[PDB]
């Protein structure tokens, strides 16, 4: 069973899953400070529900929202849009690029307990539990970033909930006893080299990407190398979405099933492989595994 914002779900209920999406983010809060310009909360919820119902109509069944407490996560909003659009949503714990003072001073043991609190107890006073750990990294490795990755690895070891991060790191995860099949390492264009992707893929890590046709061909290259079981999919292939710039692109959150899947079909990626990367791989990733 996977923790969603409306409660636990079985593996088989997850279906077609996007694994690194952005409903919540930095900018939604300013609707509280300035609704005259940005619109009401109800209008934001309405825009989000409409976009998710279109993604649902195109075939998306589950999305993983990777916003964290320090990057604008709003799990009560996620639960409302999940119910209205009939799309499962997995919430994340973790930390973003530049966390507050009060978090930058914590030990690995303390940060582990923070992540575990949001996985085992709930987020804030909502009772909604996170189903993934997101660790956003800036650039140059720093001791605090290594500390956060270690805390995430330990929370994953305790609960079996997967970790998703950005580009070394693999030695830290293995340092802590965590199987690579619990970790998705996301790569940007500056780290897109197919050689690096296959290297991490051969060691058991899941691979994410954060033009879109050239990203899709990188995916095909990875498949052609035999690594289809290590691939996760996300609307991030179109554009580097984040808490800075959320998913709410004339295809909206339906971009993957309406544009990328037909294109991969045109390039000859077979049906069983496409079902593997959109259904089997994310279900195996999200399913808590010790
Ligand atoms: Zn993303």
Residue numbers in the entry: 36 to 202, 211 to 253, 276 to 313, 321 to 362
Text of the article:
The enzyme phospho­triesterase (PTE) is capable of hydrolyzing such OP compounds. Accordingly, it has been characterized from a number of bacterial sources, including Brevundimonas diminuta (Bd; formerly Pseudomonas diminuta), Flavobacterium spp. and Agrobacterium radiobacter. The present study focuses on Bd_PTE, a dimeric metallohydrolase that has a (β/α)8 TIM-barrel fold with two Zn2+ ions embedded in the active site. Carbon dioxide reacts with the side chain of Lys169 to form a carbamate functional group within the active site, which serves as a bridging ligand to the α-Zn2+ and β-Zn2+ ions, both of which are required for full catalytic activity. The buried α-Zn2+ ion is ligated to the protein via direct interactions with His55, His57 and Asp301, and the exposed β-Zn2+ ion interacts with His201 and His230.
However, A53_1 is a monomer, with only one Zn2+ ion in the active site. Since the presence of both Zn2+ ions and the correct orientation of the residues in the active site are crucial for maintaining the catalytic activity of PTE, it is reasonable to assume that the A53_1 monomer is catalytically inactive. While almost all of the PTEs in the PDB are seen to crystallize with molecular dimers in the asymmetric unit, A53_1 displays only one molecule in the asymmetric unit. A dimer is formed by applying the crystallographic twofold axis in space group P21212. However, this dimer interface utilizes different residues and is rather loose compared with the canonical non­crystallographic dimer seen in other PTEs, suggesting that it is not a physiological dimer. The two segments, residues 60–79 and 301–313, which are involved in the canonical PTE dimer interface show pronounced conformational differences in the A53_1 structure cartoon shown in Fig. 5. Since some of the residues in the disordered regions are in the vicinity of the active site, it is plausible that their disorder, and the significant conformational changes observed in residues 60–79 and 301–313, as well as the presence of only one Zn2+ ion, preclude the dimerization of the A53_1 structure and eliminate catalytic activity. Indeed, A53_1 occurs as a monomer in solution, as demonstrated by gel filtration (not shown).
